[PDB]
């Protein structure tokens, strides 16, 4: 019974997962092709770089709020009420299951520096519980709510792994979140159908030949031998630090801003009587902050989600790269190497601007996540702080009569990382972005990174999802 | 308060740990020395190579015995009562400690077939009870029982995790084994105090020089581009569900000799006249058995736990080492290949002699775990199915107009996690080998195998550790 329940769920979640990104990426191209083709005059490229993601925010703000209203926010403070025993039944339902999709697929797709992580834990739950329902037409045993309630913890595990195609991190941060005391029998169903979810994800990513392979999604080449010298510990070890700052700062932002916009008068009213006209402002300011040929080259705007945190991942070193650059095709990473300015400068800027940016999309009344802007803005820092180490020692460290170079890729992956759990207070980030990035190597600086970080932002700050429950 | 005393436990746990693997390692080299040393007749040979492991385990025995008999057995099943509810006082006792330290070095320098995972588990116990005992005299708040019981539980994942030197594998370990409801909280406690003891452990090796850098334990240098391939997954799985055999089987067997040893009661009254004896017994007949020149030249009996689970961790092809083998320096593979037995042979005769000699040696009253031979044999199990494997495909698999060699280790690391995970019941075991092996990219696979072993395991048989707390 239990064990056919976790396969279907994790086949539907994978066919679920491939036909979202899927569509995210479909939307994403034809962005990019409306953008190119329209390159004749600045007026019309600007224009359209407006127009399209405040088209898809006002579609998917207006379908979720028809269709159920329940379905906006990240969920998983509803699914952390749900675990603790208070059950809201109006959540699960096919409505709600079909407005929060199509709205998180708008979302991704507009291009908005959002997260997938929230949306899709809720639709896991939510799919888990009218799987529940169906089988309950073929038998009774499925009405039992202790039951049901396990299949719903499993569930928010199965989607969070699958999230990130990986099943040990995405348990791990559905059992940190979602609830504080937690079964083995209930980890055992969770991670068994994680596995099977993320097995077939992959399956039909390689049939659809988007990956040759069943591989990782953010492949990495760092040096297995010699990743890593001791002497990098300590720096290491400050990068967790103050990500802790940038997550326990962040935290108190999105709190505030939520609050500003529900203790002003003036602003509720405009809300009540113009609730599409916000997020079409919000997304017309962040459309042109991040127009590509204005702004977006202090910031490399022309790059989506995914393969800024590929570029950010790169083992190159970009300092250097002004003698070398002559026997290679142009990579992506050149998108951040704008002629005017330093690449030190472009990172503090987007570190700075990013940060606000992502602060305030949070609160957008539309189904979406935090961990990836997070994620982002966090492997920025550390290949930041990676570019400005390798700068202070051009030729690497000396160690045994060898040389290293410093590779910035292993203190973005590092600051990522901990910037990621020092905002959610969560331990998995390090498996998240060791599965994601498919090497182990740097396990030791990582883990010590997000332990600070981690401790600091709780010595700080509560969880964000804390932060919503006590909000909402 | 919490967060010294972690730091303190992982200190002091990992200075134990390192002085631990130092004598152990002098005992082996001692031993080996002592072989090596009197080659010019093989009877005075196997004089030394019986009299030396039989010298240590009735040492170890009789200090056991003499100083506190509670430090027999593993102590995992122990702690599951403590963690249960139970509290067992006389375990925890400097005494115990002592005994347990003294008679866990014994018995691993003898060069026996045992691990460490258990009795190292209760040493972990034992100091974080002792160092509360001893800070509770600057200060009442650590006579809480509830605290008093949480440290326990973090210290269970702090020795599990430095045995390996995984924070994470060993803290999801010790929650699959000593509990099945965990607070995230004691999660936190433990992971932090293991992760800071696989840091000092580290330093330590580094500071000796045993390790050039802070590396893993049992590195692997397989293709991280194309580790295996799509066909190579249901072969990989039918070699999780025979390791579930082979895991059913063995709880099986261990739980059959004790009741034998239990039953009979010519064999008890013996135990109770010459209690001495029966370990002097069985090391003689097993040192006989892995005599290197007699029957060791079918089963590699010159190497120890450590080097035969690197070498089983080889990436190299050992059917086709007859023709590249002259600009190469003699490896250690090359114990496993002598003139008169193929690979497949001695692979075999390894499998079905080691089984029952680690059946045998895990029902001794000594401090001894079973988690290294069954990993070690599931290793060899691993390497077996691999090298038939690329028997059958000696030119590898073609897949996109290219031609992929097999590489054997993948399948003994596979081998090695599943047959772990089904003797043990835990799904972490995968982790545990992921940070051993340093390489996570046959993530996959090791997991179908994991999960399928596990599944046919709980079918069959229960754990290893619930077999012994039945059993005693």
Chains 1, 2 share one sequence.
């Not at 396969?7 to 979640?13: A, P």
């Not at 045993?141 to 991190?169: D, H, K, Q, W």
């Not at 080259?297 to 022309?302: C, E």
Request: contains cysteine.
């Amino acid at each position: 019974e239990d064990w056919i329940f976790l396969v279907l769920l994790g086949l539907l979640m994978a066919l679920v997962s491939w036909v979202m990104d899927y569509a995210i990426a479909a939307c994403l191209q034809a962005q990019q092709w409306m953008s190119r083709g329209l390159n004749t005059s600045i007026l019309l490229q600007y224009l359209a770089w407006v127009t399209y993601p405040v088209v898809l925010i006002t579609f998917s703000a207006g379908f979720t709020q028809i269709l159920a209203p329940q379905a906006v926010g990240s969920g998983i403070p509803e699914m952390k009420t749900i675990l603790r025993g208070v059950v809201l039944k109006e959540y699960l339902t096919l409505k709600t299951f079909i407005a929060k999709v199509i709205g998180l697929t708008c979302a991704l797709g507009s291009g908005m520096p959002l997260g997938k992580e929230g949306p899709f834990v809720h639709i896991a739950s939510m799919c888990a519980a009218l799987l529940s329902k169906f089988l309950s037409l073929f038998g009774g045993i499925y009405e039992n709510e202790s039951r049901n309630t396990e299949m719903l913890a499993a569930a928010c595990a199965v989607g969070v792994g699958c999230c990130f195609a990986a099943p040990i991190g995405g348990v791990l941060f559905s059992i940190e979140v979602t609830s504080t005391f937690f079964a083995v029998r209930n980890y055992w169903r969770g991670f068994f159908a994680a596995t099977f979810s993320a097995f077939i994800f992959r399956v039909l990513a390689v049939w659809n030949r988007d990956e040759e392979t069943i591989t990782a999604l953010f492949k990495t080449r760092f040096r297995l031998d010699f990743p890593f010298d001791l002497q990098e510990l300590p720096a290491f070890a400050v990068i967790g630090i103050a990500s802790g700052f940038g997550g326990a700062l962040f935290v108190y932002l999105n709190r505030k801003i939520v609050q500003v916009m529900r203790k002003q008068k003036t602003i509720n009213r405009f809300l009540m009587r113009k609730r599409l006209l916000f997020p079409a402002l919000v997304t017309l300011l962040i459309s042109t902050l991040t127009f590509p040929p204005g702004f977006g080259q202090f910031m490399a705007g022309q790059l989506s989600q995914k393969e800024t945190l590929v570029t950010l991942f790169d083992n190159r070193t970009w300092v250097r790269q002004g003698l070398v650059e002559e026997l290679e095709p142009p990579s992506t990473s050149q998108a951040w190497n704008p002629p005017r300015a330093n690449v030190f400068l472009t990172l503090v800027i987007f570190i700075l601007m990013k940060f606000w940016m992502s602060a305030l999309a949070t609160t957008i009344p539309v189904p979406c996540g935090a961990f990836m802007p997070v994620f982002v803005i966090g492997a920025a820092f550390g290949r930041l702080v990676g570019e400005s180490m390798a700068a202070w020692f051009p030729d690497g460290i000396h160690t045994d009569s060898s040389t290293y170079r410093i590779v910035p890729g292993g203190y973005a992956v590092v600051g990522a990382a901990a910037l990621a759990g020092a905002v959610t207070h969560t331990v998995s980030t390090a498996v998240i972005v060791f599965e994601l990035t498919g090497q182990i190597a740097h396990i030791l600086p990582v883990m010590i990174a997000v332990i600070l970080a981690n401790a600091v932002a709780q010595s700080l700050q509560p969880s964000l999802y804390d932060s919503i429950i006590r909000i909402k």
